[PDB]
Every structure is written in structure tokens, then in C-alpha cells.
Write a protein that binds this ligand. Structure first.
Ligand SMILES: COc1c(OCCCN2CCOCC2)ccc2c1N=C(NC(=O)c1cnc(N)nc1)N1CCN=C21
Length: 823
């Protein structure tokens, strides 16, 4: 088809990468995958309920926390329906349906209830208490506003028609070269399974010249028949490590990899997921390469008491605790006793000799008897553990994915970023994991939307994985539907337009922080310019797809007075039934790796949900934030928010935050409401902060809302202090120096509960952390020590309370020091 090519060109624009391109490839794993993924797309496409697919209700099954019950303790809920001019209020039970609500409305005196100002719908057989919008309003003291109108046509979701032996192992190393570069140098070759080195050989070292030829067969200890699926041949270059590259020994059709390869290699920055990729370096003209030859096809009682004790001990340990040789032989010998314990599984499967066919066969036999796994309650931290870089067996990874099926869409969103990054640890482009993302994204539009940007964030920035992630995007976009394709297109254009301006603004003053409004005159011109004949009438807010944004409030846009020169932008909201005028605020910023900011924010969200599970609410404020490309993207602007900094030559007054709060609080009520929140918000930011290692912060980077909510910003690259709890904060808590106050006693009390609530999920956190570093940064011990592993709840409460007081001793000391250390 001719028009099927316009489609493929529309898909390339949206992706920012071309998936038909075979210039940087050496087999067909990508194309085979493009093709393999059709089945699962089509099936979930052919499977999803058109109506609910259009209206994408954002629903949960989790109970309501006691803290939103106390916000409505009379079995009643007020919803307000809107005609066009007129409205009418309604009184409702938290267990009503939107089905049932309407009825009482019509029967008071076909159509559907939609949130005011937002694309967001109250529909489906769910009790109104279980809608997130609703729960957002209750937490926010806000009243629900809704608008009775037509269902969105499910034709708007239409999907285009698609069309489509015992010989030891060896490798010859012919040589290396690079146009430009002198120590000595050798090639180390590694047979790798899940970070585990199975066998290793080196070359002789020879002098580093632009072309280096060895002509040497490298014989390893392993038999061909014993190489396992997912084995990487890992080629490295030392002198010590300068370059690396990887190749799959067994391919996506289970064929032993044969032949001549010339492989363009990656270089080291001056251990993380980039070191694992089977992608070759695209920059063919400047990169180091290496020439290789492969010519190696069929592939395919009781327990004593003290031992069980030792055994269970090992299972009790944390992820990061390494296993002895004895521990592994122990796990593997009573592997059937081990299988009974699903927490054991990671330890057990990293206690397998992946280097032996008979064992591996045994391990498959053992995964057949899986019934205890399959019946266990879904433990996500356990499940994630089996998808990190320590696992590279398809069958082990697949039982982890299986566990994920039972997640509802609401949980998926909590884990989506980190599940998207765990695609970096799969050995083959077509994983169970990828198909799970595909499927879930297609099943639900909210998932699909974030799925898009998560993939595009990396596709647009990582040469190590763009090709893989692109194949997967294409596969999503090819099932998401015309209305969302349209949308994604509006959104991409806008983003593209707005980076041009961000970058161009920057190079008009390198660091003369005084933003002369001569610099601000041009911003205005480029925006109006963009307006009249370029910039789409309206577009979805990427970090909050409920909102559709309209036209730039050009007067309210500025450039911020930073080291970089990020854009402060305010838009009009495109929805007419919006119940307010407040502009939608966005910061576009070149200069920070916002991928890392996404990751920290996302954990932050996980922690709330944790805390939710024990009826705590720390009023974290994890703002929207998306990496769009290389060191560039968007950040959500919180309304009525200011820097602790600005509330103050390194001089720091104590009272001024409380004064600031009282001068923004009209009633005395609202001021106490504000001090309450500040304690909660603060307590939460301090705990989370501590756990992750990002509490030593300058005042620039901590803000507070007019309404008392404190929040940290900008997770750039992170004497000392465990968190920021300065005198200004203490002042507000009505205490100073050595004495105490009820507000401080409360804050201490709240920190404690917050901390060990988190410690009830020590493994989950430890994983997400370790994954974050491997896939988000360019060591982990910190966190385990900060979570105080293996301690009774008292030891811990004591620890964290000592921490509180470290900041008390210090006080301004550190804050001061940033200034001092400027000069
Ligand atoms: C300090 O700049 C911010 C705000 O400042 C208000 C000051 C702007 N005025 C007000 C009206 O006229 C223009 C001048 C108000 C709100 C925010 C914010 N920064 C930020 N964040 C950052 O600046 C930031 C920068 N880099 C990175 N990586 N992350 C966040 N956020 C996050 C969401 N809320 C805000």
C-alpha cells in the first residue's frame, strides 16, 4: 500500500526514531519482534470493551483510608451536576454507582457524568467512593463538580487495518580499530548470564595503535551444549576499562550464533543497565570496533532441624545480602523445600549453575511444580526482584510477569516507570514483560498515555536502548486508536515547538542571572509568533492527561532567574466547563537530567500508597515531570508555592516562615490548618528524604504552598545533615532550641510511624532503589543502613529520633555553608 507508508511515517514522527531502519543492526531480532508483537496487540485490541475504553474510568478496589472516612462520617456525599447554565446538587451514599446516582437524578425530575474541566468520567459498576477523582476531592477538602453529557463515541477509538555437541566453546578475536586515540591494551571476552560470569578468557596485551590485530582463537572451559539461552558474549577492552560490547550467543530462534561480526562498541563515562545492552554503537565513523569469528544447529525424604534453621535464616535475609557458596549449595540441595517458600525464589534461582544443561533442565522441572508460587498472594517487591539484572532466564522471568497479571490498573500506574525500565534487563527484544506492557497500555488509556512518554523519554535520549523501546512504542501506537494518535501528535508538536524556544532563550545569557526584560521581550515575540500559525489550539498536559491546555497567557510567561534559564509558562485551560480561571503552569527546562527526577517522584508516589495501606497521609506533593529528550523537559507548577529561600548574606531568621504563613492565612482557622499540614508534609518529606539519601538540601530546593504544604524540588545529583529540619521549621512547630511543643511531639510521633510503615516494605524499597540506580544514574548499602535492616522497631525509632536531633544541633550551620562555599 501507498497510504500504509504515510502511516509508518506518521509513527516515526511520533516516536522520534525509525523502526524500519537496518543500518545499525546485525540480525533481525527487531523485525522478528515488530512482527511477533502483532498477535498480542490485536488480541487486546479485539478484547477491550469499547465504551469503558473510551471513558477510562480511573478506579481502585482498595478500601478508603480511615483518614478520608473522618472527612465524611455521616454516610453521605455531595455531588453537583451541571446542565449548561443550571446546576443541581445531590446527596449520595459512598457505595452508590454512577448508574444508580443518575437514576435518582432523572427519577427526580443515555447520558454520563464527567468531571468539570477535565477529561475524566464517573462510569462503570464501581461505588463512587472507589473513583480517584472522588478520593482526590475528599483529601483536598474540595467538592465534586461534574457535568451531564453524551458519551464519547467509541468510533473515535478506531484502529487502522494492519498488514504484514561436546566441543568447547570458542571465539576468534581478529582485532580492533578506531580512527583516533597510548598504554598497552587487551580484549577480555566474558561469557555472561545475569551479571554472573560463567567463563572468561583474555588476549595477550599489545601496544595501543589505531589498528590492533591478534588473530587468536580464545578457548573457554564450557561446552556448546551447556551455553544457556540469554548468554551474552561480552567483549571488553582494557589498558583500566575503555570500551565494551555484547552479543547474544543463542538467538531469538534458539540458533547458535555463527559467523563474522564487526561490532561497534560503546565507551565508558569518567554496574548499570547500559553495560548489558545487545545494541551496537550507531556512530559508525568515530567508534571503536572489534572483529570476531564464531564457527560452532540443534539446541532446545526429611530435613534435619538445624539445617532448616540455617536455611530459613538465609531466606529471611535481605536482597542485598550476598550468598556464600555453602548457601547456594544449601538452597540447591533442598531446592524442593525451598520452593515451598516464595520469598526464597530469587535466592534459589541465583543459586543455579546456569552454566550446566542438566541443572538448567532440572530447574525447569522444578518450575513445573510451581503451585505454591501460583497460589501465593502477589508480592510485588519479590516479583520485581526476578526482573532485575541478576536474572536472565526466560522461564524465571516469565513466572514473575505472571504474578503481575493480577495487578489492577491503579497499581500498574504505581509501578509503570520501573516496569518500563526493567525492559533494559531483558536479554531479547520480545519479552513477556514487554507484552505485558503492551497489553496493559492497550487495555487502559491512562496506562497507554504514560506508557507513551516513558518509552519516548528513553527513545529520544538513550542510544543503548532506543531501538528496543521503539519497537514497543510502535506496537503500542499501532493499537492505541486514532483519537489517542491524534492527541499524541498534538502533544509531540507542542513539546517540539517549546524546546526550540527553551534552548534559544538559554544562549542569550550564559550566567548573568539578572534577567534583563530585554531578554524577556523576545520570549513574548516567539510565543505570539508560535501562537498565530503553528501552536495547536489545544493539547493534553503530558504529566496530567485529564487536563487539556489551550493558549499561552503570554503576559504571565517569563524566564526564571536561574543558573539555567528555564521557562515559566502559563496556559489557559481549553475546557469551557472548567470551574475556574487559574492558568495551567509549566516549567520547560534545559539542563537537568529529568529522568532521575521522574524516578524519585515515582518512588515518592509508591510511598504514599504504602502509607495509605496503614491509614497515614503525609501530604507529599509529587509534582508532574517528564523527560522529553536529552537533558530537557517539563515540570508541573504548583499554585501558590514559594521557596523557603525567598521567604528569607547567608543570614537566616527563625520567625519569618510563621509570619509568612500567618500573612497568607485569612482566618485563624486556616492558619492552624496550614500549621497542621506543614507538620505532616514536613514529617513525610523528612522520612522519604532520609531513606533515599537526598535530605542534605539547600533552601532553594524546598518550597511551601500558601496553604502550609511543604515539598522538595529538583533531585539533581544525589559537614552534613540527614534531612532539612531547620530552626524556621521548628519555630512553626512552636518550639526553639532545647524545649518541646505538642506540634513537635506530634511531628516526632508522625515521623516514627512513617518510617517503620516503610520498613514493613523493606524489600520493595530496596529493589526499586537498586533498579533506579542501575537505570537512572550514569552504594546501595546506604539505604539498607538507612532502613536499619533486621532491627526491632525500638532500635529503629531510637535511630530516627537521634537523626531528628542531629539537625537540631546543626541548625543553620549547613544552610549557611552553601553560601560560604559559593565564595
Ligand atoms: C521556584 O519556581 C517555582 C515557583 O515559583 C514561583 C515564582 C514565579 N513568579 C510568580 C509569578 O510571575 C512569575 C514569577 C512556583 C512553583 C514551582 C517552582 N519550581 C518548581 N520546580 C523547579 O523549579 C524544578 C527545577 N528543576 C528541576 N529539575 N525540578 C524542579 N516547582 C515544581 C512544581 N512547583 C514548582
Amino acid at each position: 500500500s501507498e497510504e500504509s507508508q504515510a502511516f509508518q511515517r506518521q509513527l516515526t514522527a511520533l516516536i522520534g526514531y525509525d523502526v524500519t531502519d537496518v543500518s545499525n543492526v546485525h540480525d533481525d531480532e527487531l523485525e522478528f519482534t515488530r512482527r511477533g508483537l502483532v498477535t498480542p496487540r490485536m488480541a487486546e485490541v479485539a478484547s477491550r470493551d469499547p465504551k469503558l475504553y473510551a471513558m477510562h474510568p480511573w478506579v481502585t478496589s482498595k478500601p478508603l483510608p480511615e483518614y478520608l472516612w473522618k472527612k465524611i462520617a455521616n454516610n453521605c456525599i455531595f455531588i453537583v451536576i451541571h446542565r449548561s447554565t443550571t446546576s443541581q446538587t445531590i446527596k449520595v451514599s459512598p457505595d452508590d454507582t454512577p448508574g444508580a446516582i443518575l437514576q435518582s437524578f432523572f427519577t427526580k425530575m443515555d447520558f454520563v457524568l464527567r468531571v468539570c474541566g477535565r477529561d475524566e468520567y464517573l462510569v462503570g459498576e464501581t461505588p463512587i467512593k472507589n473513583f480517584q477523582w472522588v478520593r482526590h476531592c475528599l483529601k483536598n477538602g474540595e467538592e465534586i463538580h461534574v457535568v451531564l453529557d453524551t458519551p464519547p463515541d467509541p468510533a473515535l477509538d478506531e484502529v487502522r487495518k494492519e498488514e504484514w555437541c561436546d566441543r568447547k566453546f570458542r571465539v576468534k578475536i581478529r582485532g580492533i580499530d578506531i580512527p583516533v586515540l597510548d598504554l598497552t591494551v587487551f580484549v577480555e571476552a566474558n561469557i555472561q548470564h545475569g551479571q554472573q560470569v560463567l567463563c572468561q578468557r583474555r588476549t595477550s596485551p599489545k601496544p595501543f595503535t589505531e589498528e590492533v590485530l591478534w588473530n587468536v582463537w580464545l578457548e573457554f572451559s564450557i561446552k556448546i551444549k551447556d551455553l544457556p539461552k540469554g548468554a551474552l558474549l561480552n567483549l571488553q577492552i582494557y589498558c583500566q576499562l575503555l570500551y565494551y560490547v555484547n552479543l547474544l550467543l543463542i538467538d531469538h530462534r534458539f540458533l547458535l550464533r555463527r559467523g563474522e561480526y564487526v561490532l561497534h562498541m560503546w565507551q565508558i563515562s569518567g554496574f548499570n543497565a547500559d553495560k548489558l545492552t545487545s545494541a551496537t554503537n550507531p556512530d559508525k565513523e568515530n567508534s571503536m570496533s572489534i572483529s570476531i569469528l564464531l564457527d560452532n544447529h540443534p539446541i532446545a525424604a526429611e530435613m534435619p532441624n538445624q539445617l532448616r534453621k540455617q536455611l530459613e535464616a538465609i531466606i529471611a535475609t535481605d536482597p542485598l545480602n550476598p550468598l556464600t557458596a555453602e548457601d547456594k549449595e544449601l538452597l540447591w540441595h533442598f531446592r524442593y523445600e525451598s520452593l515451598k517458600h516464595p520469598k526464597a525464589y530469587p535466592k534459589l534461582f541465583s543459586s543455579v549453575k546456569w552454566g550446566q544443561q542438566e541443572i538448567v533442565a532440572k530447574t525447569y522441572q522444578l518450575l513445573a511444580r510451581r503451585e505454591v508460587w501460583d497460589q501465593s498472594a502477589l508480592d510485588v517487591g519479590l516479583t520485581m526482584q526476578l526482573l532485575d539484572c541478576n536474572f536472565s532466564d526466560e522461564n524465571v522471568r516469565a513466572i514473575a510477569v505472571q504474578k503481575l497479571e493480577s495487578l489492577e490498573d491503579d497499581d500498574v500506574l504505581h509501578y509503570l516507570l520501573q516496569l518500563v525500565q526493567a525492559v533494559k534487563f531483558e536479554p531479547y527484544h520480545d519479552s513477556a514483560l514487554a507484552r505485558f506492557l503492551l497489553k496493559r497500555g492497550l487495555r487502559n488509556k491512562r496506562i497507554g498515555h504514560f506508557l507513551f512518554w516513558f518509552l519516548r523519554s528513553e527513545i529520544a535520549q538513550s542510544r543503548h536502548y532506543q531501538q528496543r523501546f521503539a519497537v514497543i512504542l510502535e506496537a503500542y501506537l499501532r493499537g492505541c486508536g486514532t483519537a489517542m494518535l491524534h492527541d499524541f501528535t498534538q502533544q509531540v508538536q507542542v513539546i517540539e515547538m517549546l524546546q526550540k524556544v527553551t534552548l534559544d532563550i538559554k544562549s542569550l545569557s550564559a550566567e548573568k542571572y539578572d534577567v534583563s526584560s530585554q531578554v524577556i521581550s523576545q520570549l513574548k515575540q516567539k510565543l505570539e509568533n508560535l501562537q498565530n500559525s503553528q501552536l495547536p489550539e489545544s493539547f493534553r498536559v503530558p504529566y496530567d492527561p485529564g487536563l487539556k491546555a489551550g493558549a499561552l497567557a503570554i503576559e504571565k510567561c517569563k524566564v526564571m532567574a536561574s543558573k539555567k534559564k528555564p521557562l515559566w509558562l502559563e496556559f489557559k485551560c481549553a475546557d469551557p466547563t472548567a470551574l475556574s480561571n487559574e492558568t495551567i503552569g509549566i516549567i520547560f527546562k534545559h539542563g537537568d537530567d529529568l529522568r532521575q527526577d521522574m524516578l524519585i517522584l515515582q518512588i515518592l508516589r509508591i510511598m504514599e500508597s504504602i502509607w495509605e495501606t496503614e491509614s497515614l497521609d503525609l501530604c507529599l506533593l509529587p509534582y508532574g515531570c517528564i523527560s522529553t529528550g536529552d537533558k530537557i523537559g517539563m515540570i508541573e507548577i504548583v499554585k501558590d508555592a514559594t521557596t523557603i529561600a525567598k521567604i528569607q548574606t547567608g543570614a537566616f531568621k527563625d520567625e519569618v516562615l510563621n509570619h509568612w504563613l500567618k500573612e497568607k492565612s485569612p482566618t485563624e482557622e486556616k492558619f492552624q490548618a496550614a500549621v497542621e499540614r506543614f507538620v505532616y508534609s514536613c514529617a513525610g518529606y523528612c522520612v522519604a528524604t532520609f531513606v533515599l539519601g537526598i535530605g542534605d538540601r539547600h533552601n532553594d530546593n524546598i518550597m511551601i504552598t500558601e496553604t502550609g504544604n511543604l515539598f522538595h524540588i529538583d533531585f539533581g545529583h544525589i559537614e552534613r545533615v540527614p534531612f532539612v529540619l531547620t530552626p524556621d521549621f521548628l519555630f512553626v512547630m512552636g518550639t526553639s532550641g532545647k524545649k518541646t511543643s505538642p506540634h513537635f511531639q506530634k511531628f516526632q510521633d508522625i515521623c516514627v510511624k512513617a518510617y517503620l510503615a516503610l520498613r514493613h516494605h523493606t524489600n520493595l524499597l530496596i529493589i526499586l532503589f537498586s533498579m533506579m540506580l542501575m537505570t537512572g544514574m550514569p552504594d546501595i548499602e546506604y539505604i539498607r543502613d538507612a532502613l536499619t535492616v533486621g532491627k526491632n522497631e525500638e532500635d529503629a525509632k531510637k535511630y530516627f529520633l537521634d537523626q531528628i536531633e542531629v539537625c537540631r544541633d546543626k541548625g543553620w550551620t549547613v544552610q549557611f555553608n552553601w553560601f560560604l562555599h559559593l565564595v
